[PDB]
Motif scaffolding. Structure first.
Motif, PDB file in Angstrom:
ATOM      1  N   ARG A   1       3.178   7.037  30.064  1.00  0.00           N
ATOM      2  CA  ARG A   1       4.491   6.567  29.758  1.00  0.00           C
ATOM      3  C   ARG A   1       5.340   5.710  30.877  1.00  0.00           C
ATOM      4  O   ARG A   1       6.307   5.106  30.778  1.00  0.00           O
ATOM      5  CB  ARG A   1       5.423   8.021  29.644  1.00  0.00           C
ATOM      6  CG  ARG A   1       6.958   7.720  29.074  1.00  0.00           C
ATOM      7  CD  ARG A   1       7.601   8.983  28.830  1.00  0.00           C
ATOM      8  NE  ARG A   1       8.849   8.802  28.319  1.00  0.00           N
ATOM      9  CZ  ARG A   1       9.763   9.631  27.720  1.00  0.00           C
ATOM     10  NH1 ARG A   1       9.407  10.980  28.072  1.00  0.00           N
ATOM     11  NH2 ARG A   1      10.935   9.516  27.386  1.00  0.00           N
ATOM     12  N   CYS A   2       4.763   5.973  31.987  1.00  0.00           N
ATOM     13  CA  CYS A   2       5.321   5.307  33.374  1.00  0.00           C
ATOM     14  C   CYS A   2       4.022   5.695  34.493  1.00  0.00           C
ATOM     15  O   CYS A   2       3.291   6.041  34.361  1.00  0.00           O
ATOM     16  CB  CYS A   2       6.480   5.679  33.776  1.00  0.00           C
ATOM     17  SG  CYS A   2       6.979   7.756  33.622  1.00  0.00           S
TER      18      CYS A   2
ATOM     19  N   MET B   1      12.555  -0.143  26.749  1.00  0.00           N
ATOM     20  CA  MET B   1      13.196   0.389  25.534  1.00  0.00           C
ATOM     21  C   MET B   1      13.213   1.928  25.518  1.00  0.00           C
ATOM     22  O   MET B   1      13.990   2.134  24.910  1.00  0.00           O
ATOM     23  CB  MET B   1      12.539  -0.164  24.259  1.00  0.00           C
ATOM     24  CG  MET B   1      12.129  -1.671  24.156  1.00  0.00           C
ATOM     25  SD  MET B   1      11.756  -2.111  22.367  1.00  0.00           S
ATOM     26  CE  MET B   1       9.844  -2.111  22.717  1.00  0.00           C
ATOM     27  N   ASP B   2      12.543   2.394  26.332  1.00  0.00           N
ATOM     28  CA  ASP B   2      12.327   3.863  26.452  1.00  0.00           C
ATOM     29  C   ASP B   2      13.350   4.327  27.303  1.00  0.00           C
ATOM     30  O   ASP B   2      13.116   4.604  28.608  1.00  0.00           O
ATOM     31  CB  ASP B   2      10.878   4.164  26.849  1.00  0.00           C
ATOM     32  CG  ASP B   2      10.598   5.639  27.017  1.00  0.00           C
ATOM     33  OD1 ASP B   2      11.458   6.712  26.962  1.00  0.00           O
ATOM     34  OD2 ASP B   2       9.685   5.986  27.543  1.00  0.00           O
ATOM     35  N   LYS B   3      14.711   4.535  26.862  1.00  0.00           N
ATOM     36  CA  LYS B   3      15.741   4.868  27.707  1.00  0.00           C
ATOM     37  C   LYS B   3      15.537   6.089  28.515  1.00  0.00           C
ATOM     38  O   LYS B   3      15.981   6.048  29.765  1.00  0.00           O
ATOM     39  CB  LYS B   3      17.126   4.884  26.789  1.00  0.00           C
ATOM     40  CG  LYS B   3      17.407   3.216  26.587  1.00  0.00           C
ATOM     41  CD  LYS B   3      17.073   2.224  27.491  1.00  0.00           C
ATOM     42  CE  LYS B   3      17.455   0.754  26.938  1.00  0.00           C
ATOM     43  NZ  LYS B   3      17.017  -0.290  27.824  1.00  0.00           N
ATOM     44  N   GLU B   4      15.255   7.294  28.049  1.00  0.00           N
ATOM     45  CA  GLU B   4      14.921   8.238  28.788  1.00  0.00           C
ATOM     46  C   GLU B   4      14.003   8.124  30.022  1.00  0.00           C
ATOM     47  O   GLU B   4      14.092   8.450  31.113  1.00  0.00           O
ATOM     48  CB  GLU B   4      14.712   9.591  28.230  1.00  0.00           C
ATOM     49  CG  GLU B   4      14.364  10.800  29.089  1.00  0.00           C
ATOM     50  CD  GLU B   4      15.425  10.976  30.161  1.00  0.00           C
ATOM     51  OE1 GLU B   4      15.297  11.419  31.355  1.00  0.00           O
ATOM     52  OE2 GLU B   4      16.761  10.694  29.923  1.00  0.00           O
ATOM     53  N   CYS B   5      12.920   7.190  29.748  1.00  0.00           N
ATOM     54  CA  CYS B   5      12.018   6.751  30.949  1.00  0.00           C
ATOM     55  C   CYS B   5      12.930   5.997  31.820  1.00  0.00           C
ATOM     56  O   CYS B   5      12.783   6.213  33.142  1.00  0.00           O
ATOM     57  CB  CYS B   5      10.925   5.927  30.458  1.00  0.00           C
ATOM     58  SG  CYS B   5       9.946   5.515  31.807  1.00  0.00           S
TER      59      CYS B   5
ATOM     60  N   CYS C   1       5.391  11.315  33.370  1.00  0.00           N
ATOM     61  CA  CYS C   1       4.899   9.993  33.122  1.00  0.00           C
ATOM     62  C   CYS C   1       3.306  10.167  32.261  1.00  0.00           C
ATOM     63  O   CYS C   1       2.966   9.076  31.453  1.00  0.00           O
ATOM     64  CB  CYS C   1       4.522   9.114  34.432  1.00  0.00           C
ATOM     65  SG  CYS C   1       6.078   8.370  35.231  1.00  0.00           S
TER      66      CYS C   1
ATOM     67  N   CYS D   1      13.241   7.228  35.840  1.00  0.00           N
ATOM     68  CA  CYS D   1      12.688   6.293  36.835  1.00  0.00           C
ATOM     69  C   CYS D   1      13.556   5.631  37.738  1.00  0.00           C
ATOM     70  O   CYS D   1      13.049   5.149  38.857  1.00  0.00           O
ATOM     71  CB  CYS D   1      11.556   5.520  36.047  1.00  0.00           C
ATOM     72  SG  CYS D   1      10.040   6.301  35.273  1.00  0.00           S
TER      73      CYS D   1
ATOM     74  N   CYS E   1       8.429   2.066  34.202  1.00  0.00           N
ATOM     75  CA  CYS E   1       8.356   2.643  32.664  1.00  0.00           C
ATOM     76  C   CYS E   1       7.448   1.383  31.941  1.00  0.00           C
ATOM     77  O   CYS E   1       7.554   0.121  32.087  1.00  0.00           O
ATOM     78  CB  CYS E   1       9.423   2.429  32.121  1.00  0.00           C
ATOM     79  SG  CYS E   1      10.785   4.043  32.595  1.00  0.00           S
ATOM     80  N   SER E   2       6.524   2.075  30.916  1.00  0.00           N
ATOM     81  CA  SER E   2       5.686   1.414  30.362  1.00  0.00           C
ATOM     82  C   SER E   2       6.304   0.488  29.100  1.00  0.00           C
ATOM     83  O   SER E   2       5.974  -0.563  28.868  1.00  0.00           O
ATOM     84  CB  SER E   2       4.790   2.303  29.530  1.00  0.00           C
ATOM     85  OG  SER E   2       3.949   2.864  30.592  1.00  0.00           O
ATOM     86  N   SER E   3       7.647   1.159  28.700  1.00  0.00           N
ATOM     87  CA  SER E   3       8.531   0.248  27.922  1.00  0.00           C
ATOM     88  C   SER E   3       9.867   0.531  28.434  1.00  0.00           C
ATOM     89  O   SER E   3      10.454   1.538  28.485  1.00  0.00           O
ATOM     90  CB  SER E   3       8.616   0.648  26.360  1.00  0.00           C
ATOM     91  OG  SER E   3       9.480  -0.069  25.796  1.00  0.00           O
TER      92      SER E   3
END
Lengths: 18, 18
Positions: free
Chosen positions: A2-3, B9-13, A17, B17, B5-7
């Protein structure tokens, strides 16, 4: 993953992550 | 920052992060 964590010793980051 | 973050768009990430 995820990260990517800034600190590999930051266990809560590693768990979030992965 | 705590992690990258990998995306962004992934707001919780983003919140965890950044």
């Amino acid at each position: 993953k995820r990260c990517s964590c800034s600190s590999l010793m930051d266990k809560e980051c590693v768990y979030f992550c992965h």
